[PDB]
């Protein structure tokens, strides 16, 4: 599973952590996460990706389409975050092919987060 090729639980965690960091460091999207609990965002998202990446414990949390309704996220902006995931995976040492495969799974949620 990509989850395994990636190195497991801790690997997805570390990558997600860097993911949000790269987000808050980007002016163009950092705004949506204003006054947002970052360690929680890191944890939930991690849980979510492990599941989507083939992990053991599947996703239980809220419906993402529902979570992000009326949030003002645009495709450009979503794309930008995806790039934050890609840079995060890259600086993490992930091999190119795996990066894109992980980013590919992340992209599936584009339809549930983008609303404008």
Residues at the site binding ligand HEM, with contacts judged by CB under 6 A = 29, 32-33, 36, 44-45, 48-49, 61-62, 64, 67-68, 71, 73, 77-78, 81, 106, 109, 113
Which partner in ligand HEM, ligand [Xe], none is near 44 (CB below 5 to 8 A by kind)? ligand HEM
Residue 23 in contact with ligand [Xe], rule: CB under 6 A: no
> Count of CB atoms within 10 A of residue 102's CB?
25
Cα gap 24→94, rounded to integer Å:
22
The one of ligand HEM, ligand [Xe], none whose footprint includes residue 12, by CB under 5 to 8 A per kind, is ligand [Xe]
- Closest contact distance (angstroms) between CB of 100 and ligand HEM is 15
What residues are designated binding site?
A: 20, 68
User: Considering only residues 34-93, where is the footprint of ligand [Xe] by CB under 6 A?
Assistant: 49
Q: How far is the CB of 27 from ligand HEM (least distance, A)?
A: 13
């Amino acid at each position: 599973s990509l989850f395994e090729q990636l190195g497991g639980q801790a690997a997805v965690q570390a990558v997600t952590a860097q993911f949000y960091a790269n987000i808050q460091a980007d002016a163009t999207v950092a705004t949506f996460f204003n006054g947002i609990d970052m360690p929680n965002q890191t944890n939930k998202t991690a849980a979510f990706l492990c599941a989507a990446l083939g992990g053991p414990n599947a996703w239980t949390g809220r419906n993402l389409k529902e979570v992000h309704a009326n949030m003002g996220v645009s495709n450009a902006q979503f794309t930008t975050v995806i790039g934050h995931l890609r840079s995060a995976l890259t600086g993490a040492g992930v091999a190119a092919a795996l990066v894109e495969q992980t980013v590919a799974v992340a992209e599936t949620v584009r339809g549930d987060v983008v609303t404008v």
